Design a protein around this ligand. Structure first.
Ligand SMILES: Cc1ccc2c(=O)[nH]c(CSc3ncccn3)nc2c1C
Length: 189
């Protein structure tokens, strides 16, 4: 499957725009939003929804999905809109909590120039992503996949890892189709 996509601009009058902007402005109200775009990728959406169905059927009462932030440079925007946050993604970091893609609870973390690098025109880019966090544990630098939940069953693993299990600020996703880049926020200092 090709995973062809379309990019649709949201009007400030749309209730979806106010929902996205309000969440972004909880920690980044000092920045100015230029535009919010919706990413429409049917094959990526279908593979994401299939993984969500499998996760919902095994985790009981757990609310398996969260909406998190991810800053990236302008050059990565066409790669993310097509493939999401896969193995070939340039922003795959091997840092403190494992080798995978990092997502922030608060936009201010993603709004750092190291993550959302300003382009030639001074525009910064942060995605508002649907992430299947599921059941998570504390991460470590050696991880390339999540740890096993039970030492007796090394087959059943955690869904993601975090920096702090009871008060998280970050999540690390290790698999393809575990995150959908629904909205793209373009803003400046
Ligand atoms: C802890 C954390 C929290 C948020 C982000 C984030 O929002 N982004 C990235 C990498 S984004 C990228 N990396 C390289 C080239 C182009 N884009 N790391 C992050 C990290 C390491």
């Amino acid at each position: 499957k090709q995973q062809n996509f379309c990019v649709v601009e949201l009007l400030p009058s749309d209730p979806e725009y106010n929902t996205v902007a309000s969440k972004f402005n909880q920690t980044c109200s000092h920045f100015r939003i230029e535009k919010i775009e919706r990413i429409q990728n049917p094959d990526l959406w279908n593979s994401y929804q299939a993984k969500k169905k499998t996760m919902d059927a095994k985790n009981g009462q757990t609310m398996n999905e969260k909406q998190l932030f991810h800053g990236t440079d302008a050059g990565s925007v066409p790669h993310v809109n097509r493939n999401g946050f896969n193995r070939s993604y340039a922003g795959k970091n091997a840092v403190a909590y494992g080798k995978g893609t990092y997502f922030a609870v608060n936009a201010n973390y993603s709004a750092n120039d190291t993550y959302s690098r300003p382009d030639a025109n001074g525009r910064k880019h942060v995605y508002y992503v649907r992430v299947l966090t599921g059941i998570y544990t504390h991460g470590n630098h050696s991880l390339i996949v999540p740890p096993s939940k039970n030492p007796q069953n090394p087959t059943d693993l955690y869904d993601t890892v975090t920096d702090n299990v009871h008060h998280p600020s970050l999540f690390v996703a290790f698999y393809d189709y575990q995150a959908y880049p629904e909205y793209l926020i373009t803003f400046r200092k």
